Each structure stands twice: as C-alpha cells, then as structure tokens.
C-alpha cells in the first residue's frame, strides 16, 4: 500500500519513495495496532488489511509477528516481499546494508532440506547474513543464524 505520511511515523517500515511510503500489509498491521491515530488520519481498517494480507502472503501472520518482535526489541526493519531486512540498533533502513535477511516460518510448514538451502542461498547471493525466524502459535519468535561450514 501507498501512504502519504512521514516515514518516521510508520516506524520506518516499508520503503520511502520520496512523496509517499510503500508499505506491506503485515507491516501496516503493526503500525495500525500500535499507532491507532493513523486509522482515522489515513483512513485504514485493521480487518481489511488482514484480509488483503492473508491472500497476498501465506506467511502473513509470521511476517507480522516477526516485524513486531524486532521493532519492539528496538531494531529497525522492512519487508522486501520475501525476506525481512534487519538493521542494527539505531540506524534507519536503506542508509547502509542490512545486518540480516530473516525468513519467517510457522512450526507446521513442511519443506524439503534442499528447499531450505535454496532460501539460504538466496540470502547469500544478496551477500548478506541469514536468519531463520520460527514463530509459535502465541506469536513468539525464535531466531537461528545459518553459516556454511568450511575452514578449509
């Protein structure tokens, strides 16, 4: 979605396009829930954004919960459509490279090991560190960093 609002007022989520902010539904859910003033200001509905979000991403609640966990821990993040870009404490997204690319999943998701490696290789091709985020049914998150083993 495209919101004509100062970037700082949406927790620096999404992308600053200059004249507006391009922000995803799971990121917007967080700002609507924690800055309710935005609802009337920008005329957006919580339930509507969930509806659009769950048909766009599969995956939606896990992005939401991971975005929420990381902002509430004092980090700055943005969803790039596949990964959550995670930036170190203090800095604003896009200023430098992100510290991590994080992929959010639920426990029930069934995957091939080769498919997990593909996802990890996708972050490596972006020349970035990778972190898996597993989000439980209460919306709590646990994080796992991946490295290739080689001395050599």
């Amino acid at each position: 979605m495209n919101l004509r609002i100062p970037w700082k007022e949406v927790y620096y989520l999404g992308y600053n396009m200059g004249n507006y902010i391009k922000i995803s539904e799971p990121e917007l859910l967080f700002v609507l829930r924690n800055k309710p003033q935005i609802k009337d200001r920008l005329k957006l509905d919580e339930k509507t954004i969930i509806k659009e979000g769950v048909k766009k991403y599969k995956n939606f609640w896990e992005i939401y919960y991971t975005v929420k966990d990381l902002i509430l821990r004092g980090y700055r993040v943005r969803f790039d459509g596949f990964f959550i870009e995670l930036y170190e404490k203090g800095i604003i997204p896009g200023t430098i490279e992100q510290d991590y690319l994080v992929y959010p999943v639920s426990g029930e998701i069934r995957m091939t090991w080769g498919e997990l490696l593909d996802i990890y290789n996708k972050a490596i091709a972006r020349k970035s560190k990778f972190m898996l985020a597993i989000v439980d049914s209460e919306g709590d998150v646990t994080y796992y960093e991946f490295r290739k083993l080689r001395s050599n």
């Binding site: 966990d69 069934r110 090991w113 080769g114 997990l116 994080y143 960093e145 083993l149």
Partner: protein, 147 residues
C-alpha cells in the same frame, strides 16, 4: 582382518559405518563365513546408512573426527580438525563442537523437527550441524540467536 557378526564387525568391535569406511578406503577385508555385498547388509540394518555414510566419509576425510551422539538423539558429534579426542582431563569443549544430522536433500521436515534438532544441540552446548546430501554434500551450521 574383520568378521561380520550382526550389526558389528570384530577386528582385534566396530559399528558398520566405521567398518564400511575402512573397507572403502582399502585397509579392511570382511567376511560372513568364508563392496556391494557389505553395503547391502548395512542397508538391511539401517535404511539411512548411505545418507549417514556419505556425510561421515566426507568429514573424516577432511580431518574431522566423529563419534556417536545417540544419547542426545543425534547421529554424530564432531570434533574440529586438529582434534584430539581424549585431550587430558578434557577439556577441548568435551564431546566437543557440533552435533551432526546427516540428511537427504529430498527429505521433508517441519519446523518442529528443525527446532528440536537445535534444542538438543543447545542442550549439549554445541553447534547444530546439518549436512544435506545429494550428488554433492553441503554442511550448514545453525546458531541460536537471541536476536
């Protein structure tokens, strides 16, 4: 120099995976009464033998030393290159340094399984080591960030 008896090979007893390594390397001959013969027997006992062996052979060739990690529910524990299983009163980190799960590239898993594998690694103060096997073998070290 070896004798096959059930799921052990007696030499001077060895698990089938360690006996296969030496037969494949050339410093061991086996015999039932008196190789595709021994492999067929190994796979009769363990369906994941080839998966486990490919990972095992890879690391042991590269200078790593492996021991069982069954008491924790993992396939292998893995000491880094330049080793030295024994050390003194320890204490180069004690069963040290990776818990290894040999796994097929086409095998499926859910993230309950993934979280479980990391939790047991964490419980031993080690580093979960995932070794995907196919034509090639890739080793992925997973660390529990906090976050």
């Amino acid at each position: 120099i070896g004798y096959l008896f059930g799921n052990r090979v007696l030499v001077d007893e060895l698990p089938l995976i360690e006996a296969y390594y030496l037969l494949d390397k050339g410093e061991l001959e086996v015999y039932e009464d008196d190789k595709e013969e021994f492999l067929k027997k190994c796979l009769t006992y363990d369906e994941r033998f080839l998966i486990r062996y490919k990972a095992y052979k890879e690391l042991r060739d590269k200078g790593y030393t492996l021991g069982t990690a069954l008491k924790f529910g993992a396939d292998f524990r893995v000491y880094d290159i330049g080793v030295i299983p024994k050390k003194g009163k320890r204490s180069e980190r004690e069963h040290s340094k990776w818990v290894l799960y040999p796994v097929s590239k086409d095998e499926t898993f859910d993230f309950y399984e993934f979280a479980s594998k990391n939790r047991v690694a964490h419980s031993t103060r080690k580093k979960m080591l995932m070794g995907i096997v196919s034509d090639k073998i890739e080793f992925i070290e997973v660390s529990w960030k906090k976050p």
